[PDB]
Amino acid sequence: DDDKLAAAQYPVVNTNYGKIRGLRTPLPNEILGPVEQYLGVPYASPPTGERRFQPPEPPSSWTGIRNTTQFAAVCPQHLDERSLLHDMLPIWFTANLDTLMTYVQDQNEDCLYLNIYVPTEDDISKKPVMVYIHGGSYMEGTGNMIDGSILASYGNVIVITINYRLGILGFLSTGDQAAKGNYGLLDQIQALRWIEENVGAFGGDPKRVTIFGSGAGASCVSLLTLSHYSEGLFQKAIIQSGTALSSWAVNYQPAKYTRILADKVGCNMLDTTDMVECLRNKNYKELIQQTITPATYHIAFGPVIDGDVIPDDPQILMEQGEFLNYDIMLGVNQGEGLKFVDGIVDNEDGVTPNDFDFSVSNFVDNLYGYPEGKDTLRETIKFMYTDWADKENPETRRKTLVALFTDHQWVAPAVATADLHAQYGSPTYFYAFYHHCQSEMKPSWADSAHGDEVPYVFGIPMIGPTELFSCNFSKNDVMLSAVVMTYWTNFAKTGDPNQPVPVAWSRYNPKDQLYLHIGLKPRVRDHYRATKVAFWLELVPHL
Amino acid sequence: AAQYPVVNTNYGKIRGLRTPLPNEILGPVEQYLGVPYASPPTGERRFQPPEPPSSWTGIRNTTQFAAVCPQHLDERSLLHDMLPIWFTANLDTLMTYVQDQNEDCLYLNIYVPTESKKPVMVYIHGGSYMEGTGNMIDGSILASYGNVIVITINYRLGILGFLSTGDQAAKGNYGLLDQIQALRWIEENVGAFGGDPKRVTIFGSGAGASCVSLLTLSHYSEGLFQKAIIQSGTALSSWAVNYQPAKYTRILADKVGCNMLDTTDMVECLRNKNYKELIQQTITPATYHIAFGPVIDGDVIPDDPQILMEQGEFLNYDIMLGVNQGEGLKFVDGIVDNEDGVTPNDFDFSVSNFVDNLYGYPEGKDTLRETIKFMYTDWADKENPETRRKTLVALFTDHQWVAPAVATADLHAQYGSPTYFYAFYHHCQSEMKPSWADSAHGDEVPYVFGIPMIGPTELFSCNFSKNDVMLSAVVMTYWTNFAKTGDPNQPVEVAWSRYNPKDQLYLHIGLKPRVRDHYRATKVAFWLELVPHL
Ligand SMILES: *[C@@H]1O[C@H](CO)[C@@H](O)[C@H](O)[C@H]1NC(C)=O
Ligand SMILES: *[C@@H]1O[C@H](CO)[C@@H](O)[C@H](O)[C@H]1NC(C)=O
Ligand SMILES: *[C@@H]1O[C@H](CO)[C@@H](O)[C@H](O)[C@H]1NC(C)=O
Ligand SMILES: *[C@H]1O[C@H](CO)[C@@H](O)[C@H](O)[C@H]1NC(C)=O
Ligand SMILES: [Cl-]
Numbered sequence A: 001d002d003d004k005l006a007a008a009q010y011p012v013v014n015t016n017y018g019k020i021r022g023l024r025t026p027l028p029n030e031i032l033g034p035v036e037q038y039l040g041v042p043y044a045s046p047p048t049g050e051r052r053f054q055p056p057e058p059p060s061s062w063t064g065i066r067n068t069t070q071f072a073a074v075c076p077q078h079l080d081e082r083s084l085l086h087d088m089l090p091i092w093f094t095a096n097l098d099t100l101m102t103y104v105q106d107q108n109e110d111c112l113y114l115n116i117y118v119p120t121e122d123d124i125s126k127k128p129v130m131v132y133i134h135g136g137s138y139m140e141g142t143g144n145m146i147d148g149s150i151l152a153s154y155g156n157v158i159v160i161t162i163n164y165r166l167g168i169l170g171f172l173s174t175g176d177q178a179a180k181g182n183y184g185l186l187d188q189i190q191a192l193r194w195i196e197e198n199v200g201a202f203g204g205d206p207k208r209v210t211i212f213g214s215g216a217g218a219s220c221v222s223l224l225t226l227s228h229y230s231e232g233l234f235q236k237a238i239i240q241s242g243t244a245l246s247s248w249a250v251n252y253q254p255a256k257y258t259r260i261l262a263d264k265v266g267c268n269m270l271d272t273t274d275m276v277e278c279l280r281n282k283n284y285k286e287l288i289q290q291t292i293t294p295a296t297y298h299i300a301f302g303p304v305i306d307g308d309v310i311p312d313d314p315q316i317l318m319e320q321g322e323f324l325n326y327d328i329m330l331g332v333n334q335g336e337g338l339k340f341v342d343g344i345v346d347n348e349d350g351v352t353p354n355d356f357d358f359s360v361s362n363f364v365d366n367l368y369g370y371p372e373g374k375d376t377l378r379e380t381i382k383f384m385y386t387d388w389a390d391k392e393n394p395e396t397r398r399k400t401l402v403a404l405f406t407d408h409q410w411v412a413p414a415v416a417t418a419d420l421h422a423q424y425g426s427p428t429y430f431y432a433f434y435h436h437c438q439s440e441m442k443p444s445w446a447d448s449a450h451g452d453e454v455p456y457v458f459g460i461p462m463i464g465p466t467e468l469f470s471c472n473f474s475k476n477d478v479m480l481s482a483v484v485m486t487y488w489t490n491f492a493k494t495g496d497p498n499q500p501v502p503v504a505w506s507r508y509n510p511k512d513q514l515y516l517h518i519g520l521k522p523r524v525r526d527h528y529r530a531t532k533v534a535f536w537l538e539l540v541p542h543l
Numbered sequence B: 001a002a003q004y005p006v007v008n009t010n011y012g013k014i015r016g017l018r019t020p021l022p023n024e025i026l027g028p029v030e031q032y033l034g035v036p037y038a039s040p041p042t043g044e045r046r047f048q049p050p051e052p053p054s055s056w057t058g059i060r061n062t063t064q065f066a067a068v069c070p071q072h073l074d075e076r077s078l079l080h081d082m083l084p085i086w087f088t089a090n091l092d093t094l095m096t097y098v099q100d101q102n103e104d105c106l107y108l109n110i111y112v113p114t115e116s117k118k119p120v121m122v123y124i125h126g127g128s129y130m131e132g133t134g135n136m137i138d139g140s141i142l143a144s145y146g147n148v149i150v151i152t153i154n155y156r157l158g159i160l161g162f163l164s165t166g167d168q169a170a171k172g173n174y175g176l177l178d179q180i181q182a183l184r185w186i187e188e189n190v191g192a193f194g195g196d197p198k199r200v201t202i203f204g205s206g207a208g209a210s211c212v213s214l215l216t217l218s219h220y221s222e223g224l225f226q227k228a229i230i231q232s233g234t235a236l237s238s239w240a241v242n243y244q245p246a247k248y249t250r251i252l253a254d255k256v257g258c259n260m261l262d263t264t265d266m267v268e269c270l271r272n273k274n275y276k277e278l279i280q281q282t283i284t285p286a287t288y289h290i291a292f293g294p295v296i297d298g299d300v301i302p303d304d305p306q307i308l309m310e311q312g313e314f315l316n317y318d319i320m321l322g323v324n325q326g327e328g329l330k331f332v333d334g335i336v337d338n339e340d341g342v343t344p345n346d347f348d349f350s351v352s353n354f355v356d357n358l359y360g361y362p363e364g365k366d367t368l369r370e371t372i373k374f375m376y377t378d379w380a381d382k383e384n385p386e387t388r389r390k391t392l393v394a395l396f397t398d399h400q401w402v403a404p405a406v407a408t409a410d411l412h413a414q415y416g417s418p419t420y421f422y423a424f425y426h427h428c429q430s431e432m433k434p435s436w437a438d439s440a441h442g443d444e445v446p447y448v449f450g451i452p453m454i455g456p457t458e459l460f461s462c463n464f465s466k467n468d469v470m471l472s473a474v475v476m477t478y479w480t481n482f483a484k485t486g487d488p489n490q491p492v493e494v495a496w497s498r499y500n501p502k503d504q505l506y507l508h509i510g511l512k513p514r515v516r517d518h519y520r521a522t523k524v525a526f527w528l529e530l531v532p533h534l
């Protein structure tokens, strides 16, 4: 280096595709060191024209030095704001999205970019790498929305956020060879390949890559641990409030929704090859502006069992042992399913016996459909989710309904995953998350909800302002963020959330079933919601 | 001499005895033993309702127990293995009471304290309708301690009390009608003993509690008592009522040479048999059921007890009822290992058999079996073999005692009739009880009758401490306050709140008595609400 100061302030890295120039970025927090930011790094060719509804290809090489100093365009996205998938998004998701200048007026089908946050800290070795897969129900979001600077600086790990194709463009499938689906997953895989080959140039360790995600990102992470395409690309996974086993994780009726789309957009031809080519040439505004409403608690565009990328049912893939070679941390938040009681809560924060019966009846219609012994099943669910010690209390009735949806959609599938992963000694760690930041939009009576661990994972309380991310942070929030980031980055470094940086988080196994209660008072407990989980995992599959 | 008090009854004068009690600060008691309350149910009056007794001239001695009703003591029986540890598990020391038997057995015993007209507590013994006697309970301590008259009764048992053809040849329920006739006698005569016929409480344990429950639901009981205490039994359990009397009467009649198909001829033939010929026969009912007991006759018991309760027949009475923590102890006989545990195989076997025996085959038997297995598994400690033992005791206790007691209480308290509920959580030290066992079937009886205030007796079967003495005083005060006022808190203690279906307040009775709520509410709702849909 000749101009050593320029080389420090505007660091240049030589990738396999050419040189890029990033930005050394100080962090306002006095005790956090600067990070190098490389924003808008292309990891694949633009999936445009004939590459729409096709797997991603490697990016083009270049000569000279390419600036990677600001966020690239976001993947095209729209979704009906009354959609159940839209209403299940975190309380902070939309407001934070609208903060992004790239989101607001820089959507582009050319969107396969990633963002890299490198600690400037000097190890006097190669740093662990944490790769984040954002949520948003497969339809919305961007890696740009998460600043990985503080996690990187606090943990002395490289943090990478990725953009992958969303919605129709990422997941359209015909259920046959014309459009095999899973484009967004293949994008994630191609990012991980790029990372494997290029992260060494940033001082990163390809042999210590952890993938992590929340919501639909956690479903993606779970699905990647079960695909042969992912092998040798990462060694650890953290799975936050999502799984491969939930009703909205996989689309079992892709052809139906693709046809509904085609007909809304002037592609009424029956031949699937011609229909796909017609959609392939449609202006993308036309496509993403359509409202294709799935059956309740299901998805219209998302991952499919294609027989290749996802060879079979996720339960079967877990039973066959695909994910056993990864160390896995996974968990849930106490009241993920808060939106389940949207509409049915009164001004005294209660629900009526009538509302309860209706809600359970609709739950069974939508999630079980018409199984052997449906009437028995509905009755047994009502019984299990009634508090017989206080059966006239309307506020308790509200709580049990949130519990029903939380248990079924998040808790039982997480525990099933944990049990399938831990059953032969593969390292497994389970958490239940009990804290949430103060937010005026949230009801007083609400527990930790869907997306509420995310501010703690990314160290947002340390950024500076008390009022950010739809939160009002306290000193306890700062402490809890530090606890969480230490566990998460320790895990990335060693596969053990207790090592090397200093309460002991014990390993999960199906026998003792130890889990970390994460809150202001972290503590190891056992058999999380054991009776309700056993209900869903053991009794119900016979009713 | 004052040692031999004479009382004029409506039928003639009787001589009893003034008995000192070992304790000097408990008053003496006058005892009138073997008082006839009905004519002998013999000859043509076998299998007929009881008639009033005959009058007599002069003074008739009522100075010793009369002969008990015929009964066989059989260790092959489950209705025998069911009986309290004190009842029959002590053998040659119970035979003391049951050796002098006679079909002429319609006698009662009266215990009058010597301290206005006194309340009267009338006790109906248990023994599965098949065995026992009032003579086995000495009412002297309860009477003297509570300042109430205590009366124990003998009623026809087994075949002679309960044989029925299921038609008009033998309508059944002779034993219940005996109890009614004793209550009539008491209503008409107890005044001569200083008793108040307007303050009569009936009480019973086990099958005696089932009898009490059934009497609250019979129009024949009207005007004979105002209060009931119902200890560890109901009208609603599988062994309370015989829904198949003709079957078992036919089996008996065939063993004994009464093979006629005409039921009038079969009954008259049975009348001609020696009673010993009858009580000797092994007649084995379906498991958890009875061969000879109360029947739905259309008269004494017009309909299913559930239906009688919903029509409100017992709404006039003030009722105290309860159960013991671990009633169903015998359910796990033979499957508890030397470390007090039960295996998962023995758990699955017990539950499966439980369902075969109590549900037979309802709409969805497999669903039912798997659901019961789920509900009685401790999913937070799935491998613990001692917990597995506890949950089996709980299964049987919940089904046979707790759920039907709560159903009875709810139906009684529904529209504001005074109702009190208890759960009994203490038992005396006994070497033939396992160290891990909770309060079992019959374990409240020594406390109700003040047995710790005398000491270990032959029948009980207990070593007693200071705590047992105090618990007896607590129980006797509640029981006798209730007989006095209808309120266990008032004579003219921890406050025992009324039971209603909303708040569901009950008294935890033990060394630390206290009011709690919603006793085993989840398990009770399982049996009462969900299961009838499975
Ligand atoms: C790269 O960014 C820097 C910083 O603003 C700018 O001076 C330089 O001209 C940029 N290079 C190109 C090719 O845009
Ligand atoms: C009544 O009992 C007394 C006291 O034992 C006795 O003196 C008398 O002979 C008895 N009367 C009879 C048997 O008629
Ligand atoms: C009472 O205690 C004695 C010790 O004096 C013991 O031998 C006996 O077995 C106990 N009795 C019962 C019924 O448990
Ligand atoms: C943050 O708390 C302040 C009071 O300190 C309040 O005015 C504001 O509405 C809160 N913001 C959120 C997003 O909860
Ligand atoms: Cl490119």
Ligand SMILES: [Cl-]
Binding pocket: A133, A134, A135, A136, A141, A214, A217
């Ligand atoms: Cl996210």
Ligand SMILES: [Cl-]
Binding pocket: A528, A529, A530, A531, A532, A533
């Ligand atoms: Cl639970």
Ligand SMILES: [Cl-]
Binding pocket: B036, B038, B039, B040, B052, B053, B054
């Ligand atoms: Cl007579």
Ligand SMILES: [Cl-]
Binding pocket: B124, B125, B126, B127, B205, B208, B445
């Ligand atoms: Cl008794």
Ligand SMILES: [Cl-]
Binding pocket: B519, B520, B521, B522, B523, B524
């Ligand atoms: Cl319970």
Ligand code: NA
Binding pocket: A026, A027, A028, A029, A030, A031, A032, A033, A034
């Ligand atoms: Na700083």
